[PDB]
Design a binder for this molecule. Structure first.
Ligand SMILES: *C(=O)[C@@H](NC(=O)c1cccc(O)c1O)[C@H](O)Cc1ccc([N+](=O)[O-])cc1
Ligand SMILES: *C(=O)[C@@H](NC(=O)c1cccc(O)c1O)[C@H](O)Cc1ccc([N+](=O)[O-])cc1
Ligand SMILES: [Zn+2]
Ligand SMILES: [Zn+2]
Lengths: 399, 399
């Protein structure tokens, strides 16, 4: 369970000194990355999230307008063009407010949930980088919710359900939730903080979540929730966050017309469920020790012949499986069946179809699994129906 | 047919002076963008392309090693960290060679086709920017093919079929193909250029392509093909390119073991079919004048009630359509049916389901189209089956 070693073994990705802290996603690693996006997008559709894409760099004046310049100028890559200074974005938050600021918003547009798979960059010191855990370039399952003060409870509830629903898919059921203590220096009136804290307390009680408080001084712009998961080694990984913001929407001139026809500043909720998706892939790689679940496996099926007679039967089978949506490969090499089955077992391919002369004549296929289990000859249509169920259900275990 | 005006009318995207030449993709514009990616990925799977993701910035030493530094340093955004200079990538080519350089390659790995939806940036002068046509940040349907000299014909054939197959999906059937004349200053032996030119000439003859030559001096690293399409206004848009490269793989120390067991440098083919996908969306926006085909339309169906009695019937219908994969919205507003049908017609929603008291009791739905055609009451299952066919076929016209 070392994601850097398994990543090299499975040809998932690589890094080199020319771009420290930035991942070269290979084909198989990118397949895992994109399958994660499909999973998140499926959850986004459930909770009615927009998906947007912001610009990678933005004017340094805009970043100074947010107030994040002074606090995080060290971590921000800077670039220039035509006597103007630009910042490679370390966060997606101001860009979403820019999209929100387009057009007039009323209360009828709230809550407005805006998600983005935003590529962000941070100038982290090189000595602190490690694999996919600590990088300079990363993609967050980020989203921001624009809502009234009244909707804070209902929106935090949805984030809470999202965290537990999503972590459970991967097998993470032990979750520790920590709440933040309000600092001395804070933005926003005390009554605003008091009302929002009641919203958070009611939401956490509603979901029956035992929560602890954190010794850290907490964020100045709002109350913060952090979700930590535990992998099969009982290792704690902090991935989720729900951060309230009373500062940024006021700074970036965001507003909406309320029911009373009065100009109001929306409440802004920052939330990520998995956090850094590169980091989450590394966590998943160590969690499964390379035995990725079928829906996450880069190559899900390999079909092999025994000799060249079955080689054309294999090619039809590969096409029939590929049309069914299965990520399949054909192994027609001039190696005998024990060699290929072992090699694809070592590469963690979930299923392995053996096509002998009996298999060609029967119309069936001989099925082996990467754990060495022999499921015997099965109907080709039956095989497809079972993997499709395993893929669509995103099941954690095989047949 | 002005994509900037239609983009504002349909809330597709926006741009602001804080990030000149970079697009804020709104939800509906991002839906078109992502649907284009799915279309390209479907074509990638047909031709057995890998999909990878490279780092956004790379060491300036690596860029100087390519030789693109001296020619294109002006157009490249530069940034630094820890006394080292980095370049925000304007091209995906060197990053793919880096991924190719991982692991030992043999001739049995060739041809190796490597595609990437790579976000690239160029420091284009601000006065030259225009909408999505001329931007600083763009995403290309880029790919690179690593192959032997012998495979150049078969690979150019696949690129040629890809260009015509993909342009035809959008209704672009008039295509002008231009070939490049070899310059005085060139990289690679004359015999290499002579053999590759024969490969290109045979490939273009094979597909029966009438081609012209270009007065431009042509690329120094290899022969170049450019594909121009014509929209419904008979306007020429140059989108596709197939560029041969004898220079870069040798520079970046790329190699493979041949059949003769000799260390050889692969031939590199750069190819993009649509080119800048932001630019292609703008072309598509003007081609359809906002009447996007059903598979490309941001919102494909709107269901409306006449009064609150049908409001709960509409919500079930919206869910049943959404589970079927249709991008659908519910319009339960307190406006009468003529108001809503007109508003969604003005917003170019392909289909429009009207749910009266007759519709609730029958189990059917009243169907209108954005062209004003009345298709009458239809079965809800029948409606779903027809849009699914229209979406999956990517048909250019409605029922
Ligand atoms: C405060 O605004 C906080 N933002 C978030 O925590 C946040 C989490 C998840 C999703 C979104 O959209 C969020 O805004 C803070 O700015 C986080 C942060 C810390 C450090 C740096 N840095 O430049 O080193 C950037 C952002
Ligand atoms: C020559 O290498 C040429 N590259 C391409 O034309 C190309 C087209 C489509 C896909 C890929 O992967 C390609 O490499 C040239 O470098 C193109 C180019 C021109 C200008 C600039 N610029 O920095 O202004 C960059 C790239
Ligand atoms: Zn945020
Ligand atoms: Zn290239």
């Amino acid at each position: 369970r070392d994601h850097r070693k398994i990543g090299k073994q499975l040809d998932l990705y690589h890094m080199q000194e020319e771009a420290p802290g930035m991942v070269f996603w290979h084909n198989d690693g990118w397949t895992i990355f994109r399958e994660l996006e499909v999973f998140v997008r499926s959850k986004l559709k459930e909770y009615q999230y927009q998906e947007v894409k912001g610009p990678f760099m933005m004017d340094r004046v805009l970043w100074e307008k947010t107030g994040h310049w002074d606090n995080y100028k060290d971590a921000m890559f800077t670039t220039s063009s035509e006597n103007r200074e630009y910042c490679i974005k370390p966060m997606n938050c101001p860009g979403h407010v820019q999209i929100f600021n387009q057009g007039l918003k009323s209360y009828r547009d709230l809550p407005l949930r805006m998600a983005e798979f935003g590529s962000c960059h941070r100038n982290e010191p090189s000595g602190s980088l490690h694999g996919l855990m600590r990088v300079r370039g990363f993609t967050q399952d980020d989203a921001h919710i624009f809502c009234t003060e009244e909707q804070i409870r209902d929106e935090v509830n949805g984030c809470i359900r999202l965290v537990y629903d999503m972590y459970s898919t991967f097998g993470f059921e032990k979750i520790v939730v920590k709440l933040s203590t309000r600092p001395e220096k804070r933005i926003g009136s005390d009554e605003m903080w008091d009302r929002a804290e009641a919203d958070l307390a009611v939401a956490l009680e509603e979901n029956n979540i035992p929560f602890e408080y954190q010794l850290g001084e907490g964020a100045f712009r709002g109350p913060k929730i952090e979700f930590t998961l535990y992998d099969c080694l009982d290792r704690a990984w902090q991935c989720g966050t729900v951060q309230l913001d009373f500062s940024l929407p006021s700074r970036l001139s965001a507003s909406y017309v309320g029911e009373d026809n009065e100009r109001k500043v929306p409440v802004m909720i920052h939330r990520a469920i998995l956090g850094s998706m590169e980091r989450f892939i590394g966590i998943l790689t160590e969690e499964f020790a390379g035995f990725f679940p079928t829906w996450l496996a880069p190559v899900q099926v390999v079909i092999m012949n025994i000799t060249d007679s079955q080689s054309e039967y294999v090619n039809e089978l590969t096409q029939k499986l590929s049309n069914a949506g299965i990520r399949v490969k054909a192994d027609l090499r001039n190696e005998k069946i024990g060699f290929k089955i072992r090699e694809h077992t070592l590469r963690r391919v979930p299923y392995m179809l053996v096509c002998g002369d009996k298999e060609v004549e029967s119309g069936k296929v001989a099925v082996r699994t990467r754990r060495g289990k022999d499921l015997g000859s099965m109907d080709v249509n039956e095989v497809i129906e079972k993997l499709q169920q395993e893929i669509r259900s995103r099941s954690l275990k095989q047949l």
